[model samples]
Structures are given as C-alpha cells and as structure tokens.
Target chain A: RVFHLCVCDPLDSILTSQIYNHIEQIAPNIHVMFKSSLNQETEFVISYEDFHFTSVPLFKDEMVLVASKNHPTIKGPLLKHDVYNEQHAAVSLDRFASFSQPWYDTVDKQASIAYQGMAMMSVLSVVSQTHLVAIAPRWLAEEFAESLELQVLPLPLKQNSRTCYLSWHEAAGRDKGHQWMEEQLVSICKRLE
Target chain B: RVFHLCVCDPLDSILTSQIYNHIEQIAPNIHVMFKSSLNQETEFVISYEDFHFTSVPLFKDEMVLVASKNHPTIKGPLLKHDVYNEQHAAVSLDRFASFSQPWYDTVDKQASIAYQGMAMMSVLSVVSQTHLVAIAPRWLAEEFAESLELQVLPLPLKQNSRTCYLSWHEAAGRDKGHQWMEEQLVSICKRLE
Candidate 1:
C-alpha cells in the first residue's frame, strides 16, 4: 500500500513521530509518502487548514520563543520590543500556502526577518547554531530543546495559540484503512493535548 | 549593521556553519540575516545564480544518499534502480527558482517524492525519523549524521557532483566589509573542497 501524508510543518517532525513509526512497524510493505497535496492519492492531511473536507480542530497549539542556549542577549522572558529588536528566523512568509505561517501576521514589515527557513526544524537548526531567534509551537520547542540545546520561552503575545485541524476527504470516510489511520492520527495527536 | 543573506538551501545549514558562528563571535553587533533574494539589501549571495554579477565557481559539491541509520533495505551503496525505488523527501521542485534543486533535475516524475521540504535540514530531519530516503550533499550528510543518526552512502550516478558558484554584485567590490565577508565566505567554503 502507498500512503501519501500531507502533514503540517513543525507538527509532523516535532514529536518522536511515533505514529509513522507505528505504521512502519505494522505495515512494513507500505510506501509511506510525505507532503503530497490534497489529491486522490493523498490518504491523510493534518494542518491548520480547514476547507472543503471532513475536518476537526485537533488542539490549541501554543506558540513559544526559541533561542540558542548560549545566546548572548536572550536567556529568559522577553518584552515585545526585546523580541522585535533581535533578528529572527521565520518559518514561511508565503501567505498563499494554506498551511504556511507568517509568524507575526502583520500588514507592514516589522520584525527583523533575517532567516527565511522552509521548515521549523531548519529554523531551529539555524537558531541553535546562530545568534538568530524564532517563535515556534510549544510542542516543537519541547521536542527539539534538548537535542538542539534550545532555550524556550513563552511567546510575548496575548494570543499565542492556534487551532490545528485534522482534515480528510469525504471518500476517506468509507475506507476502512483510512478510518484506522484517522483513529491512529487522532489518538497520537491527543498526546499533545 | 543589518545585512540580509540569500544562501543556497542545503549548503547554508550544513557544515556546522562556522561562518555564521564566526560572525557572531567577532562582529557581535552585525545582524546576520539569512535567505533574502537578489536585491539591494541582500549584501551577499552564494548560489549557482550568476546574472549580471561578479561570480566564481567555489567548489564541486558531491551529493550522497541519506537514510536513517536504522532504516531497512538502504544500508549499502545503491544502484541507479535501487535509488529510485525508495520513497523520497525532496527540496523545492519549483523550476522558477534559480537556486532551488530538483534532485534528479529530471523531466519525468521518476522518484516518488513523499515529503516536499523547504530546506535540506528539515528533509534530513524527516529522513531521520521516517522510512523515506533522500539525495543530499555529502557536506550535509556528514554534518548531520551523528545528531540525526543518518546512514550516508555514495550517490549512484556517474556525475554525482555539482559546481557551487559564489556571486556578488559589482557595488560590493568597493565596500571593505563586503570584501572581508567575501573572503571569509570563500575561505570557509574552501574547507568543503
């Protein structure tokens, strides 16, 4: 079986990702595909995007501030000014992508966008070795903190959380395998909740 | 001083990135920005793009096959057929990007692209946890092998290396800081040669 998975950025690689591990263990024959767009071939998608699909909000993902453990200026809590003063490593500035996140979500240029990383993993990678800082999901920060030697702090914003949605096509409702996969996804996702 | 940098994908995050570290150590005041396109603010660029700029081929980057150390059926050097058989996590496939890599640079959809990552770091991150495999620079594979538990093997192709060019605008020729930065870049890149 070939399963195309379109999981959200940061979220997919954040956890030990035991879900994929479980799938690999159970059905070693499956050619597990990652990041295919919502097509007939795509068996699953989990992101913040909710459109014409059978979808549900999985959980409220709390954003956090991440820096290198040895960073000179950013060790603890930061003010909004302090946050903006430092250079940043952002995920995706592309507003077109339904799953893309434009960290600040502002109309005018504000933050010192130094590094435009494609994924949270790279952003954290960049942040860990460089003087740059970034805002990421709490789960991702906790996930990579020890390995990357990252310093995690609360996002200095009033609304620091966003609802992540689990989505599937209507036809997936009938597929027993899809149902099993959906159950696996939901069960694994609850660990974050 | 704040300067935007437009570095190539895998090359930038790889190499323990002592360039950024050196800048942070010596010129702690300079805000080192990453991933700005060719623009007035972008002081330096290191990519294959050499349009209307003073450019030179830096080195021949040898690509390698990367799999999780624990991955089954991918521990040895692969044949061309063995290479395409496995599912993949690819970098940007956009033909428009002068710097974006389309792994095989092929016309036909031959490799099963499972994960479409924005950067090589995340692709490696995905590859470390999942059964998927990828073709990445030897520098990147070596840089991340221990941390990510990756198994690196020789790329199964006659021409497995690519010429990475370093490019800069004519205006930068006069700036002392730009010249110094350029020297630093070239010297560090030479270590990869």
Candidate 2:
C-alpha cells in the first residue's frame, strides 16, 4: 500500500534526512511530501507541533545566539545585557517569536528586533551581512557558521532546548503503511542518537 | 510581465537569494518563477554549463577538501596522496563529477568514490557520518562545516575555481521584463562583490 506523509522543513532537520533515506530503502512504495507549514489538511507533521498524539521524543535541539564574526560590539560569550542592547534578527513561526519562552522574557523586552522572518537563511543572511545578532538553533548556527562568516556564542543565561516530535491523526492508526512508516522513522531517529 | 528563472542548486548559492529578494522588491507586478535545475529551460543557470550565450562572469567559487572533525586519519592539511588513498563522496551534474577538473585528475585515478550523487546535502551527510572526505565548492563546505561537525582542510596544491554564468536565450533579450530583471541581477551581483 502506498502511504502519503507530510513533513515540516525536512531540509532544516538532520533527523528528517535520516527518516527520508530509511523510508526510501525500506518502503519504496510510500510517497513522502514535505511542506514548510502545517494545517488541518496535513496527514503527518514532523516538527514541534502541539498535537495530542505524537511519536516519542525524536531529537532535542538547543537555542544559541549567532552573530557575524566582525560584529562591532558583541563578541565572545553573550550576556543578557548585550542581547537587550544590541539589534537582533528573530525567527518566527505562526506569528510567534522563537525567543518567546520564559528564558528570553527579560531580554525580549529590551531587545531591538531589526529583522524577523520564517526562513532561517534570511536570519543568517541578515546576521552575516550586518552586525545584528540572531538566536538560532545550535545545530543550524554551527552548520552554517563557517560559510556565512558567523560565530556561535554562548548564552549568558541557562541554555534553552526544545524537542521535536512526529505527530499524526488518530483516525489513521489502523493503517499498516502509516504504522510502518512511523516505526521506520522512530527506528531511524533512535539509531542516529 | 512574467519572468521565469532557473537556478542550479538555489539553496547552495548566496547570489541566488540576493537576486530573489531584489526582484521581489523592485518588481512587484513582474511575476517571477524560479525553478531549481540546470536544464535547457532555465533562464539563469548557476553551474558549469557549456551554453553558447552566457554572462561574462556571474561569480567564481573555489574547490575545498572537507572531512568530519573527528576523522582519525586525516586532519590539519590535505595532501594529494591522502586524497587518492581516502574514500570520497562526490557530487555530479549531468554525470560529470565535481572533481572532473584537471586539478583532481590525478587524485581521481586512485580515489575510491564511496558515494556519488547530485545533492550537496547527501555528500555532506556521508562525510559527516563516516570517515569519507568530499571535494566541494569552498562556499558550500565552509557554510556547512560547523553544523555538520566537519572541518575544512587546505588542499595539497593550489586551489581550483569555477565561474558560473547567467545564461538566457537570445529570444528574450528584447523583453523589457527580462532586461529589467537582468539589470537588477547584475547590479546586485556586482554590489555584493
């Protein structure tokens, strides 16, 4: 049976690539569709979606501050005072800022958001071209740092991390193909860790 | 007027993103379609395509050696002997390997190509997970090194570089939209340099 799956920002996540390769080998008949955004129509959403039924913790991602290597004022370790005083490039999802958590609550009030967008590349572009600092996933910041001429700095406060999960509708629980895909995904995610 | 543009590996080039953003602001009424491929149909191809009519010099990118930071055998600098003896992950366009240039000719003769494919991410994934090394464009390798836990090593010999050109058919030269887009692109590319 051919099963259709929907993934969120497959390119941005390392686990997504692993899942994609595993499914391609084990279940060639299954067709996987990647979408950047999620809605009610999505069959399977693989991201940090707050759905009732979701897979076990797939992977954990931490947030870090990124800036151009040549930034004028900010350098070395990042502090809450520096975050509040400097210009920032923020990434948002569904109109919600990535730094909306309690960890950033104090800094957010004083931070000057110079740019905001959904695309991580845009955030990187802005930070690389300008002196603005951006809060990004540590994995992404590390991945693009050398090419973009950006540096990853330690956050002054405690580290903040988020877990991503694979969510699916309960109505499709009986489908063998869907279950098989989920099993393959879970297996791949676990093995990679 | 609507303008269709083709970009080769749109995700890999910094210039492509600049062109896309510039076009969006200056030409709101001008509909632009972007396809990521190097076929005959694309208006702007960003690879080593031997088309009859192409731009003077869109951009120049160099080649680099990339390996995981934890590669036990290789670190610091890369020698021709190391390249020839080590397993390699290669990227290809139209069956022509990325290492097809004369600079790689000697190494290619002895190199064991462990993995070969079109996608840059695949080559990166292989190199990051395994002990294989990949010869990739410096821009891409540098950009992805930090995140993938990879390191960029100096080549044993002098660097090799390739220039990508913007190729379009002669039939569209008279179109105002095409000319406008080209002018905008040329301006952006120059300003970026």
Candidate 3:
C-alpha cells in the first residue's frame, strides 16, 4: 500500500527519525512519501488546518529565544526591551507563513529582522554564530543548543505555543495500514508530551 | 553601518559559524545581516549569479549521498542501480531551484522521492534516523554525519561538483568595510581548498 503524507518540518525531521526504521521493520511493502511543506494532495497532513478534517493536537510547541552561547551584547533570560533592542534572525515568511504558527511572523513589538532564512537550520545556524538572536520552538532550540553553541531562553512577550495537528479528511478514513501509521504517529507524538 | 548579506544554506551554516564572531571583533560598528536565500537587496552575495557583477569562485562543493548509519535496505558505496532503487528525501525544489547547484533537483534517473524538506537540516535530520537516504554537499554531510548518525558515500554516477560564487555589482563596490568582507570571504574559501 502507498501512503501520501504531508508534514511541515522540523517535525518532518523529528518524525522521520521516529518512523522510517520502525515502519520498515513492520510494513516492508508500504511505500511512504511526503511533501515537507503542506501544499499536497496527501491523505494525511501533519500540520494544523482546514474544516471537514479530523484534526488532533500533536503537541504544544512552545516558543522560545535562541542566541549564541557567547554573545557579546546580550545576556541570559532576556527582557522585552532586550528582545526589541537586539537584531534578529528568522525562518522566512516568504513562502508558507499563512499555514505556520504565527509566533515568529505575527508578533508584538518585533525586533529588527537582521536575517530571514529558508529553514530553522538556516536561522539556528546563524543565531549560534552571530550576535543576532531568534525565536523558535523550545524543542528545536534545546535539541540544537549544545552542538551549535546556542543558548535557549523564554520569549519575553506574550508568546503563544502552537498546537501542531495530525489531520485527515473526515470522509476518507479506513484502511489498516493508514490506521497503523496513524496509531504510530499519535504514539510517537505522545512521547513528546 | 548596516549591510545585507545574501547566502544559501549549508554555506550559510558554514559561513555563519565562521564570519559572525570574527566580523564582530574587527568591524564592531559594521552590522551584518543576511538573506538565507538570495531574495534580498544585499551588499555582498555569497552565492552564484547575474551579469555585470563582480563574481568570484568561493568554493567547489562536491555532491555526495547520505543515509542512516545503519540503514537496513542499502549499504555503503552505493551502486548507480541502488541510487534509483531506493526511496529518497530531498530539499524541495518548490521554491528556489533556479539559483541552486542543480545536482539534486536536476539529476538523472531520480530516486522515488519519499520526502521534500524546506532546508538541509530537515533532510539531514531525517536521513540520520530513517530508512530513507539523500544527496547533499560533501562538507555538509561529513559535518553532520557524526552528530546525526549518518554515513556519507560517493554518488556512483557522473555527478558534477558545483562552483559556488561570490558576486556583487561591479559599480557598487567601494566601501572599506565591503573590501574587508570580500577579503575575508576569499580567504575563507581558500582554506577549504
């Protein structure tokens, strides 16, 4: 059986590590493919959106700040003034900002955007090396911190956490293989809790 | 003094880890910002491009394949047949394929794409954990292999290396800070040789 999966990343990265090997062991005949960004005609979409879709909360991704561990201009646990005073790095809103959590793109008292990246890696990588800072998911910031020499802190604003969703069309439900995949996805996301 | 720097990923990660701190030391008054993609009005562009611009080779990036360190279905030193025989993950061509190296996007006998990511980390992070494999730059693959539990292998086909360029408009080059940045960029590329 073939499965068309839609996932927005770094969840793609997160889930890829979780699913691929396990899926191979049990469902060798199943072919899995995905659109890393959600412009797809896939059966399962692992990002939030749409009516007539069976959307389940995957996880509450809390927003946080990231900066170089040895940044010269800034210190730990920034204030709202520090947030705006410093320049920033961001995952670009040029492509799919509408579908993404509006934490970084649509926020209050925005920082001067020093850089706009194509991905979290692009933003995180720069943040670790520059005097610039960024806002990203707590899990992602913590995961990359040690390797990239980064420091993660809370967003000093009224930052909102986005509940990522595992959604599917309401009418299109049935198939043991899809059920298996869904079960696995839910279980995997549950561990992140 | 504000400056815009346009860079692509992998290189952005590489140069970010290199330039930021150093730029802070010497040019304290000069601020550095970037477009992780080339879609910006920047003083220095660290990517290949456009006529009437002063362009120079930054480095020659060789193409390589990456897979899980213990990938179940495939093994090291992949044959050309194995290249096409597997399901794959990729950095999606949906956005900026035209400016890119064209190795992964424009290739022969493409693998059945299993996923398309927004960035290199998305691809690398997944390739490390999943049954899927991907193609990436040699330096980047080797850099992340140890951390991500990935293995780098040569592409069996006649895949070509891409010459990354640093281009800026001929008439627009004057500032001492710009000259300082250009000199530093050239030296950095030379070190990779």
Candidate 4:
C-alpha cells in the first residue's frame, strides 16, 4: 500500500545501504512485511532524509543500438563502425542531459532533437514497430530485443553504464517482506551479473 | 535540408498561410516543390508565438468495465462496478501534459498521484500480460492488449475519432515533396476513416 523508496546519489553511499548483493545477505529479516525494490526509472534523483534502504552497486550499463532484426542497418559492419549516425527514439526524462552525454561524445553529435514516446517502454515499442533504431541501456535492449524481434548491437566504443538501486524507508528495515524482496532482487542481479 | 514545419495547437486548425493544401486549392498558379511531412509526437500546445508538441494525449476514454475475459474477480456479481481508474502505461505517447483539465470526464475519477513505472508501456505490458479487466479506448487498450496477449472485453459505446495533420509554410507552396506527402496523407486518412 504505502511504501517509501529511499536512495542516494550515484556518487554517495551511506551506512546500511549497499548495492543489490549486500542487501541480499541481510534480507531475511524483513522478508514478510513491507514492499522493497529498486526504483527503475526515477532513481537518478533521491534524498536520504525520506528513505529507509537503498539498492547497491550502481548498475552501469553500456548504451547499445536496438533495431528490428530484419533491418539492413543491423546486418553487418554498420554495427561495428565509429562515426555512424543512427536515428534513435528518445524518451526524454528529467535527467536527459546526463544520459545523452555519452553517445553524443562518441559521434560528436547529439540527438537532432528530443523525440516523444510516453515512456521508455513506448520508445522500445515504437522502435520495434517502425523499424526505427534506438540507443538504450545494454541489458534492457538485449533483454527486450530477443522477445520483441529486435537485434542488439554493441557500440564500437565504450559508452556509459548506468547504475540501478533499491531504496526503502527506515521504518521498513525491520519488515520481513521488504527484506525478502530486496534479497531476491539482489540475488537476481548477482546471478545475472 | 532546411524544412519549416507549420506546427499548430491541437484545438486549432492549420493556418492556410502555413499549409499548401489551402493555398493550392485557392492559388493554383503557385508551383510547389516536394519536401517532407512535419514530425509530431503527441498533441501540440500554443505558448506565445511558438508551439510545443508532446507524445501523449490527456483525454481518457469514458467507459464502464463489466468483466474480464479470464474470469478474474468473479466473486462480485459485477466484476467492476463503475470503477474508472486509468492504468498509466509507456506504450502510448502520454508524457508531457501541455494543458491540464480540472478532471477526466470520461473516467469520472480524480487523477492518480502515484508514480508507478518509468515506461508507461511497462504497466500496459505487464497488465496486458496478466489479462486484467479494464475499460479504455479501442485504439489504446484493445490494440495494445491484443498484441500483448491480453483479451479486450467489448462494450457498446460511441466511437470517437481524431485526426493528425501535416503542415508547412505557404512560401513552399510549390514544393512537390510537400504536395505529394499531403496528398498521400489525405488518402491515408480517407482509408482510415
């Protein structure tokens, strides 16, 4: 019902706050009580005064090119070339300035302009339907590409990696459900990584 | 190429001076060259002199939910009784609320204060995956639900349709690409309607 997600900035870490793995080790205590998990889309900005626990190890993922599997652009060397300009559907978020810096650095160019799709998933949906290209977190691109009939292409150069975390309110620290959810997520992250 | 897009607000008509359809129908002597269709995401809004576009519509489909295909929530005589809560999803261009209305007349409910998912599509993607019960627009709910492997229970209601337009500057009245694109769009709309 009422769950408060707590998180810290990418650069700072507080006590009792660890990446997903560390949270897993101590999750049994709060497993059956409150809800706990990482904030997938809005963790970029957080304040500790209002939070209870935070996820750890800031997931840093590369930006990958996602295109329809049948598209010519995904076929061959274009996937490995530098200075390649691919049009991407961007889901503009509040932290757009931070996300764009990496790809723009590679090609010395930024998105022509902000493109609209309601949410990040909508960006993926449109890209899949229109055969358009998109640059997104490597894991999400790879994860969805397989099911959506799209291909994930690695960038020629190393792009930025984003970190993900789970934040919870201090009051929830002793709850069993919150602890269990945190541990399960952390375990999944470890197994995946 | 330097293309000028004649952007207009959602509630406003495309100006004749800004589009060739009106100019060509009136002034045949003006030879127009072809360019391209103007890009738009969601609805457009007017500020002062310039206009802004977003990737989502603020209007909700007013409908009553009676049942779900999967026999979900069967304990009650009527599965859902006059409930009109909207499930926000990333599949549609619904971000950036350019204009705010006091209330959603369709659902007859107040706006939600919860910040759920980053990609509204995720909500739709997940819910549709589970085959839940809801009443939404045919275009948004049914089209998406079908694709996501969900069932759309039908109800008797009046259908509402809206059109998106292409626009440009009158100075380019003689551009063939612009002319061709508009003609193509008109035919498309004719077929769609």
Measured against the true structure, the TM-scores of the candidates, in listed sequence, are 0.83, 0.49, 0.84, 0.54
Q: How good is model 2 by TM-score?
A: 0.49
Mind giving the per-residue lDDT tens digits that candidate 4 earns over B1-193? 2223322222111121133344345455543222111223212222112222222232333332222334354224332333334322111123232211112233343232122233324444444433223333344454444445555544333433333433334444467764664554344323322
Tell me how each candidate scores on DockQ against the true complex. Answer: 0.49, 0.04, 0.59, 0.14
Give the best candidate by DockQ: 3
| Fnat per predicted structure, each in turn | 0.61, 0.00, 0.77, 0.15
Residue A101 displacement (Å), model 1: 4.8
- Candidate 2's C-alpha runs over 4 A off are A1-193, B10-12, B39-41, B93-111, B157-159, B190-193
Report, for all candidates in order, the number of backbone clashes: 2, 5, 0, 52
Candidate 2: residue B58 lDDT (0-100): 67
Tell me which of candidates 2 and 4 scores higher on lDDT: 2
What digit string (tens of lDDT, one per residue) describes model 2 on residues B1-193? 6555644442324554465556656766664444343322445544545477655576665677889998888878866666667766554422332333344355454246544433455456557866667776676777667766789976565556666666677786788766777777667655533
Model 1's TM-score against the true structure: 0.83
**Per-residue C-alpha lDDT of model 1 across residues A98-145, encoded as one tens digit per residue:** 232555567433356667755677788888887778888888888778
Poorest 10 consecutive residues by lDDT, candidate 2 chain B: B92-101
**For residue B131, what is the lDDT in candidate 2?**
68
Docking level of model 1: acceptable
lDDT score of model 3?
0.70
What is the fnat of candidate 2? 0.00
Question: What is the C-alpha lDDT profile of model 4 across A74-192, one tens digit per residue?
Answer: 56435334434554554433343233334544333543322333334555665665435666666566656655567877666655455554444455557776565556545544443
TM-score of chain A of 3: 0.86
The second chain of candidate 3 has a TM-score of: 0.87
| Model 4 TM-score, 2 decimals | 0.54
Fnat measured on candidate 3: 0.77
